């Protein structure tokens, strides 16, 4: 993985770490909503 | 005077000589997926008056990959049924 | 019956075409108010001009809702 | 004045009457989910 | 040559050409003036 | 609408995140000036 | 019967769609030389010239945003265009890849509004100096048509885009239909057909502009 | 330290097939093998059906006309375009 | 029967359009006071033009209502 | 047959787009008028901006009837 | 039969939403006749602003089509 | 099944929303167009205060459609 | 129950009092865009008589959804 | 009973009433701004036609709302 982080992670990183620190966290809202729509459907498909 | 050499190269004879001299693993496989890739490249695109040519054929390639995909839900409308 | 609610929501929805020669009028009049604070001196021919506007929009919904009576009485 | 305490001009004013609005319609949702 | 050369070729003839990472660390490492 | 069976969700918006901030973010990051 | 060019696809039991979304990666080659040839020079002075236009109002802490917001038109503006082709597919119609990229960013732009300017951020919910008489009747609209942002931000590309597939797809059938009948219908809708396309080829850019630039002042007010 | 490139790679036939494939089968047919060749592999794909036909055929004809169109009269002005983008910077530092 | 009554519905709901003709011949002879009240000159042009528009939404309208008959008289 | 019934009034109800058409050629046409009452010189162009509109708007037009005869009874 | 009528009516009524784009469209162009009747130079930028806001009225003049198809043909 | 018939029926009736917004979008850039015309130096502002408008007249009909969409499946 | 059926309908159909404040709100911000051009030095009095308008055109189109929602869950 | 699902409909319909007035308040606001825009010696009067004219709109608008409770709530 060597060459994945010298490829993906010397140029990417005052990215990540400045300026996006604000988009991660809308990133695990998107997850929690997803979460709770597959939950919503997978419980009434269950149900019939 | 070679062991390994371009698959055209080699005769049927030999050919599972060529088959057992080179190497599989998938550090090989992107070794071999970067040649195509340069190949092309180096071939068609990074010349100073590069065309169409230099890029249709993989729209035109793109194309069919994607009806292989999709010949199984193609069946069931043929117009004629004996073919 | 089935004719009766027939004509009926027939005529109820027919006499809709009326409100575009209402909103006609309306503009047609504020565009001679622009017109005539403008130039106040051809009062009477912009005035002769609106008018017929207004025959002919009040005409176009006339139409539409005698449309609706025969509606009713077709 | 009030009018010069509920400002709508400035900066200040605006956020107090919003965060106003903002508590009473709170207190308000919280009476009525008894009933 | 110019064809023969890349960007570092330029940061090695024209220094005043270098975009610098200091005072403007991002990209287009300047500003749009 | 087969937008609505949801079984395929996760990978769509994970394969969507790799590329959206990943390779773009490699390729254009190298674009130059005039 | 038609839904179908929407369905996830698979050729087997094995997860391919994510190699119909990085394909378009590599028709924007980087280069490595300065001087270049055609199809890298051309990409080059259109991004030059698209962020000389659409990142002058904003202000300086703003300008950092550059790479995010090119990088998602350019690559939108791929998907969108590619899709077009007899039996492509187009991976933003999947509404959820269209959430998943909305959300995030109108997210973090609020946040970056609620952590710093605060008074200010709480401020814009109220217009200067608006009558006192209706306040509320007013910090209430504002704060539900905030909300809306990112659903009709995604919602609109999303079918926007579907329709048009669709309705090409309609067209020639019927005017295979119509041949059955007779010849000069099937001229007519060709040329309908082509109308479309061009169309579809616009249509399918002025989205990408219209939402990276939505966020770009969505970012110029909270910034 | 980088090396240069070629005026023009390889010449291509239909602006889509590359012509070595012809001249590779010169020696058995010479010059009306290929032709005959793809026109009854399509001819055969046809027949048998392993292509139906559908809207979506005359949405291709479409959008590959509008290309041909576009390229066989915008073409070498883009050429040219970008040539001149080229020597514009060359000169523009020089 | 059902279907007959559906025939004076729609016969009837097929004329919600001429909305339009009100509209338009409103803005159309307010663009023409406003015409003849900044430039005199035009009187005959611009009346042309108008009763143009006019033929042109009325039609329009009109031919909207040949559809509510058709349907009337299916 | 009640699919008729809702056959011709998807037929009528869906014959109303021509709203669209209307309006935006009363607009239009105004719109030729002022400018034209304004300066009488460019009168070839204005009229050409004005046949797009002509054409452009009778389109959504012809859409919405094609639509309609699309279901009256062919489907 | 009688969800297939209603899904007609439905597709009748959701036509409609086609007015609001004819309109903006003959509205945009009278503004573009007259923006230009009165400054012919810039004709360049105008022509552009309209087409950029023909294509968001048919966006949503397509939006109703295609809610009507999708009733119609798949629910 | 009547009890979804009448959900196809709302649906398709609260489809119309987005007309209004289809006008106003339409009359924005007009205005625009002219205000640009006129003083051509303030494209900037002048855009900056047509979009905003532009998205406020679309939400309220997406709005609507979101609600026929409801309405159908659930 | 076709009770609970035209209840939906009724819903649907009068959520359609909003396209109202669509083409009001549209006029509404042309109008400023041009009474902005002509005056650059009003913009503040400008906007503040602009909101004034926006907003009691939001709410007498948001009065329908309101009804519909209403209507739907309590009667 | 069907009663009132026919109430309903008719309810939830005639309450588009409130379209017109939407669009009427819009636009009187927009040619309000654009009159002040160019004569700023006249706010008073101005506001005070201003505000006859939004409420002659509203009022159109709500005697159709009002109706409609009534034909709800009384028949
Ligand atoms: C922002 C502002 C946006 C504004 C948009 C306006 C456009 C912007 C600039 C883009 C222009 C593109 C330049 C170009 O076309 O190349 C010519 C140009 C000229 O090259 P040249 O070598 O100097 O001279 C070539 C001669 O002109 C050659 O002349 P010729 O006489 O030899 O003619 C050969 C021709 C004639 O030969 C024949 O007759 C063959 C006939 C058989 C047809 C093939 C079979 C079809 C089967 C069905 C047919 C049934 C009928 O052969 C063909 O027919 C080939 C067509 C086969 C289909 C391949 C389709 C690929 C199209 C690529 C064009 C890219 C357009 C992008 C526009 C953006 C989207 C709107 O190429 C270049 O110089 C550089 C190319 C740069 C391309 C930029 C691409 C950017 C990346 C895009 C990624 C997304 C892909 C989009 C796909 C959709």
Redesign the interface.
Same mark, same amino acid.
């Given at each position: 993985l060597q060459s994945l982080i010298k490829n993906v992670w010397i140029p990417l990183k005052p990215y990540y770490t400045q300026v996006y620190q604000e988009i991660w966290v809308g990133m695990g809202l998107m997850g929690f909503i997803v979460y709770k729509i597959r939950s919503a459907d997978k419980r009434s498909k269950a149900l019939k | 005077p070679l062991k390994d050499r371009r698959l055209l190269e080699v005769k049927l004879g030999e050919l599972p000589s060529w088959i057992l001299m080179r190497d599989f693993t998938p550090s090989g496989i992107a070794g071999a997926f970067q040649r195509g890739y340069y190949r092309y490249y180096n071939k068609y695109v990074n010349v100073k008056k590069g065309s169409v040519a230099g890029l249709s054929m993989v729209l035109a390639a793109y194309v069919v990959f994607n009806y292989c995909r999709s010949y199984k839900e193609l069946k069931h409308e043929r117009l004629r049924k004996y073919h | 019956d089935?004719?009766t609610?027939?004509?009926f929501?027939?005529?109820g929805?027919?006499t809709?075409?009326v409100?575009?020669?209402?909103?006609?009028?309306?503009?047609?009049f504020?565009? !001679?108010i622009? &017109? $005539?604070a403008?130039?106040p001196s !051809?009062k009477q021919?912009?005035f002769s $001009?609106?008018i !017929? &506007?207004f025959a002919?929009?009040e005409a176009? &919904?006339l139409?539409?809702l005698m449309?609706?009576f025969l509606?009713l009485f077709? | 004045g009030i009018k010069k305490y509920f400002n709508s001009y400035t900066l200040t004013g605006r956020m107090n009457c919003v965060l106003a609005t903002y508590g009473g319609i709170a207190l308000l949702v919280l009476y009525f989910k008894l009933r | 040559p110019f064809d023969q050369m890349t960007i570092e070729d330029l940061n090695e003839v024209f220094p005043e050409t270098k975009l610098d990472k200091k005072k403007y660390p991002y990209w287009p490492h300047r500003p749009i003036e | 609408m087969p937008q609505l069976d949801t079984s395929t969700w996760f990978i769509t918006i994970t394969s969507m995140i790799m590329t959206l901030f990943i390779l773009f973010q490699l390729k254009i990051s190298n674009y130059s000036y005039p | 019967n038609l839904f179908a060019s929407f369905i996830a696809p698979t050729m087997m039991g094995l997860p391919i769609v994510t190699l119909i979304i990085m394909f378009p990666s590599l028709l924007f080659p980087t280069p490595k030389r300065l001087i270049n040839n055609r199809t890298i020079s051309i990409q080059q002075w259109l991004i030059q010239l698209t962020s000389k236009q659409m990142m002058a109002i904003h202000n300086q802490k703003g300008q950092t945003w550059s790479l995010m917001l090119m990088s998602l038109i350019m690559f939108i503006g791929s998907t969108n265009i590619l899709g077009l082709l007899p039996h492509s597919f187009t991976p933003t119609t999947q509404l959820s890849m269209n959430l998943g990229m909305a959300i995030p960013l109108w997210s973090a732009t609020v946040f970056t509004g609620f952590r710093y300017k605060t008074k200010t951020s709480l401020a814009h919910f109220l217009p200067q100096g608006t009558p006192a008489l209706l306040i509320p009747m007013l910090v209430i609209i504002e704060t539900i048509s905030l909300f809306i942002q990112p659903v009709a931000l995604a919602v609109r590309l999303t079918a926007n885009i579907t329709a048009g597939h669709l309705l090409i797809h309609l067209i020639g059938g019927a005017t295979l239909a119509l041949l059955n009948i007779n010849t000069m219908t099937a001229f007519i809708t060709f040329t309908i057909l082509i109308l479309l396309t061009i169309l579809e080829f616009a249509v399918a850019l002025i989205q990408a502009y219209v939402f990276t630039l939505l966020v770009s002042l969505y970012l110029h007010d909270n910034t | 330290p980088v090396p240069p490139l070629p005026e023009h790679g390889g010449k291509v036939r239909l602006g889509l097939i590359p012509e070595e494939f012809f001249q590779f089968l010169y020696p058995k047919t010479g010059v009306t093998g290929p032709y005959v060749l793809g026109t009854g592999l399509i001819l055969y794909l046809l027949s048998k059906e392993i292509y139906v036909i559908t809207a979506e055929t005359f949405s291709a004809i479409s959008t590959i006309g509008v290309l041909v169109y576009i390229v066989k009269k915008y073409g070498a002005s883009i050429g040219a375009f970008a040539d001149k983008l080229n020597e514009q910077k060359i000169a523009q530092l020089e």
């Amino acid at each position: 993985l060597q060459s994945l982080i010298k490829n993906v992670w010397i140029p990417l990183k005052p990215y990540y770490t400045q300026v996006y620190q604000e988009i991660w966290v809308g990133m695990g809202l998107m997850g929690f909503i997803v979460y709770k729509i597959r939950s919503a459907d997978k419980r009434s498909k269950a149900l019939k | 005077p070679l062991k390994d050499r371009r698959l055209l190269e080699v005769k049927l004879g030999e050919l599972p000589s060529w088959i057992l001299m080179r190497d599989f693993t998938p550090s090989g496989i992107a070794g071999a997926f970067q040649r195509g890739y340069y190949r092309y490249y180096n071939k068609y695109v990074n010349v100073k008056k590069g065309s169409v040519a230099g890029l249709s054929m993989v729209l035109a390639a793109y194309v069919v990959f994607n009806y292989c995909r999709s010949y199984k839900e193609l069946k069931h409308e043929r117009l004629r049924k004996y073919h | 019956d089935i004719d009766t609610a027939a004509k009926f929501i027939g005529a109820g929805a027919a006499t809709v075409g009326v409100a575009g020669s209402g909103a006609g009028i309306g503009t047609v009049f504020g565009s !001679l108010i622009i &017109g $005539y604070a403008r130039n106040p001196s !051809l009062k009477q021919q912009l005035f002769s $001009y609106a008018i !017929l &506007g207004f025959a002919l929009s009040e005409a176009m &919904g006339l139409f539409c809702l005698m449309v609706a009576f025969l509606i009713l009485f077709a | 004045g009030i009018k010069k305490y509920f400002n709508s001009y400035t900066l200040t004013g605006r956020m107090n009457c919003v965060l106003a609005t903002y508590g009473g319609i709170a207190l308000l949702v919280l009476y009525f989910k008894l009933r | 040559p110019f064809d023969q050369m890349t960007i570092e070729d330029l940061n090695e003839v024209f220094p005043e050409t270098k975009l610098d990472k200091k005072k403007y660390p991002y990209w287009p490492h300047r500003p749009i003036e | 609408m087969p937008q609505l069976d949801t079984s395929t969700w996760f990978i769509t918006i994970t394969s969507m995140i790799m590329t959206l901030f990943i390779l773009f973010q490699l390729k254009i990051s190298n674009y130059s000036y005039p | 019967n038609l839904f179908a060019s929407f369905i996830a696809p698979t050729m087997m039991g094995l997860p391919i769609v994510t190699l119909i979304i990085m394909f378009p990666s590599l028709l924007f080659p980087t280069p490595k030389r300065l001087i270049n040839n055609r199809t890298i020079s051309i990409q080059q002075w259109l991004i030059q010239l698209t962020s000389k236009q659409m990142m002058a109002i904003h202000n300086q802490k703003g300008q950092t945003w550059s790479l995010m917001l090119m990088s998602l038109i350019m690559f939108i503006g791929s998907t969108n265009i590619l899709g077009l082709l007899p039996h492509s597919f187009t991976p933003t119609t999947q509404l959820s890849m269209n959430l998943g990229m909305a959300i995030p960013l109108w997210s973090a732009t609020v946040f970056t509004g609620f952590r710093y300017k605060t008074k200010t951020s709480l401020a814009h919910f109220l217009p200067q100096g608006t009558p006192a008489l209706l306040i509320p009747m007013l910090v209430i609209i504002e704060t539900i048509s905030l909300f809306i942002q990112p659903v009709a931000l995604a919602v609109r590309l999303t079918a926007n885009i579907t329709a048009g597939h669709l309705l090409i797809h309609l067209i020639g059938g019927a005017t295979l239909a119509l041949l059955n009948i007779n010849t000069m219908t099937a001229f007519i809708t060709f040329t309908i057909l082509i109308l479309l396309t061009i169309l579809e080829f616009a249509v399918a850019l002025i989205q990408a502009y219209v939402f990276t630039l939505l966020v770009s002042l969505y970012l110029h007010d909270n910034t | 330290p980088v090396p240069p490139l070629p005026e023009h790679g390889g010449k291509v036939r239909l602006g889509l097939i590359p012509e070595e494939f012809f001249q590779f089968l010169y020696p058995k047919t010479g010059v009306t093998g290929p032709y005959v060749l793809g026109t009854g592999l399509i001819l055969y794909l046809l027949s048998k059906e392993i292509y139906v036909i559908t809207a979506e055929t005359f949405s291709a004809i479409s959008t590959i006309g509008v290309l041909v169109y576009i390229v066989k009269k915008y073409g070498a002005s883009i050429g040219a375009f970008a040539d001149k983008l080229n020597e514009q910077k060359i000169a523009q530092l020089e």
